């Protein structure tokens, strides 16, 4: 009952901002604070925000030339910017190739638009986290308010006057954005947001923590694999691969290489081999975790691609800790079960096969 117990419509609560988070407490409420801290342990809020920003950047990179984008600069903000609720700053500044004809300040879910109002060469994305609560749980409205406030007054450390304020209510899992848009951007943005909500690592972690706090919950079998029902072995061992080597000076250069996602149908022998490229791992951290997420995403994509007749029943996973992400990604497909296994299956030796290895080597993109 945190979102009623702590809430904005308080009589006299001295609104302290909780430590290293964006979670206002209207007065000292006892156990609540502790719980919040537990949830948002190890600078979780910041991680979430940064993660979101990173995702956005990635999305932008993916769709550069489609929306006429010169460069997508992630600004070097002050660490606490995630949890400075009073002020704000442009997280992802965005240079244009040609001159954008942006709309008036409007919401992310608006069917009717007009792209003949304002013009601009530069834009910005702001990601604003908030912990919701029963009174002000509406996210869209909040974001609008923020936009009205920040953009207008004196200077809100935005390089351009026009931009967008993405906002994710962490306590209600609602998201909405508001600001200025150019033709074809908005739907894409919406889609991206949806994707993030479905599966961002940080967000997932947060959710898990919340669940924990609440205490909420939802060899012999080898011959069963080869019945008439369709299945898919999925390996993630060779997704993030590295080669290490000393230079003449002495520096050990840990160079990431092109990896694979071995997805084998044991019935038909269809190896749906997604080749992960070295450009995915550029300027990243918490890398193994990221890789798992990527793998999950790929799997989801594959599933989507497959029609209802050709879709699997049991997606089998080789490793133990490839379950959760996959599950998260496969909430769209609840009919498809995700199966673990005691078998340390040898699909990590996909790179031992020659042709496959060669293919992996000779890839200049995600393929």
């Amino acid at each position: 009952w945190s979102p009623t117990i702590n809430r904005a419509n308080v009589y006299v609560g001295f609104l302290v901002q909780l430590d290293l988070t964006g979670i206002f407490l209207h007065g000292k409420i006892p156990t609540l604070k502790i719980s919040l801290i537990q949830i948002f342990r190890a600078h979780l809020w910041q991680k979430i925000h940064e993660s979101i920003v990173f995702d956005i950047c990635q999305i932008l990179d993916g769709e550069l030339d489609v929306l006429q984008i010169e460069s997508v600069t992630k600004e070097t903000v002050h660490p606490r910017k995630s949890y400075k609720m009073n002020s704000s700053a442009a997280d992802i500044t965005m240079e244009s190739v040609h001159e954008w004809e942006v709309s008036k300040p409007s919401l992310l879910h608006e069917t009717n638009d007009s792209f003949k109002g304002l013009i601009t060469n530069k834009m910005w994305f702001d990601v604003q986290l908030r912990y919701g609560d029963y009174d002000s749980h509406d996210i869209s409205r909040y974001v609008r308010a923020k936009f009205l406030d920040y953009t207008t007054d004196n200077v809100s450390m935005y390089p351009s006057p026009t931009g967008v304020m993405i906002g994710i209510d962490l306590a209600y899992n609602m998201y909405d954005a508001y600001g200025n848009w150019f033709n074809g951007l908005k739907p894409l943005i919406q889609n991206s947001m949806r994707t993030i909500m479905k599966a961002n690592p940080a967000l997932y972690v947060l959710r898990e923590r919340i669940r924990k706090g609440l205490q909420i919950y939802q060899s012999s079998n080898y011959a069963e694999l080869f019945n008439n029902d369709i299945k898919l072995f999925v390996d993630d061992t060779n997704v993030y691969r590295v080669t290490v080597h000393k230079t003449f000076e002495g520096n050990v250069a840990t160079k990431a290489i092109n990896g694979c996602i071995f997805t084998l149908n044991p019935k038909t022998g269809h190896l749906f081999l997604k080749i992960i490229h070295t450009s995915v791992w550029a300027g990243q951290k918490r890398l193994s975790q990221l890789a798992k997420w990527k793998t999950a995403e790929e799997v989801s994509a594959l599933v989507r691609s497959l029609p209802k007749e050709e879709q699997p029943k049991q997606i089998i996973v080789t490793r133990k800790a490839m379950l959760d992400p996959l599950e998260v990604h496969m909430l769209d497909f609840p009919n498809i079960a995700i199966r673990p296994t005691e078998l340390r299956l040898p699909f990590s030796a996909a790179m031992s096969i020659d042709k496959l290895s060669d293919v992996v080597m000779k890839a200049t993109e995600p393929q």
């Binding site: 302290v16 901002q17 909780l18 430590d19 290293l20 407490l25 000292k28 006892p30 604070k33 600078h43 910041q46 660490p79 606490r80």
Partner: protein, 114 residues
């Protein structure tokens, strides 16, 4: 200043991740935190005799012990601990282990249960 303090003051430049990293760097050097036999307050469940001076420390008697991790766990993923005590009269290091197979303790070259 008050035990239920919501927010501790941070300097105006406090990159939290960076700070953490710094701390880590200065944790190997650190005296405390980089050691074993971290303290604890515990009552004695066994009710036993101190082997040197025969001091009959009874059940539930409170002591400032040292809890240390035993590397050799029970089974696989359930830890067991050495819990050091001193006898009141003579300063002999009594201790015991918590082997959870029987839901009870084991004496460790300190005293004897009776």
């Amino acid at each position: 200043s008050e035990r239920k303090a919501i927010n501790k003051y941070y300097p105006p430049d406090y990159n939290p991740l960076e700070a953490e990293k710094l701390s880590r760097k200065m944790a190997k050097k650190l005296k405390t935190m980089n050691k074993s036999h971290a303290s604890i307050r515990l009552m004695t469940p066994f009710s036993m005799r101190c082997l040197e001076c025969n001091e009959y420390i009874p059940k539930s008697r409170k002591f400032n012990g040292k809890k240390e991790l035993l590397k050799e766990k029970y089974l696989d993923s359930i830890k067991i601990y050495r819990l050091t005590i001193s006898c009141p009269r003579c300063a002999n290091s009594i201790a015991f282990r918590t082997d959870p197979g029987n839901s009870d303790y084991v004496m460790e070259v300190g005293g004897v249960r009776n």
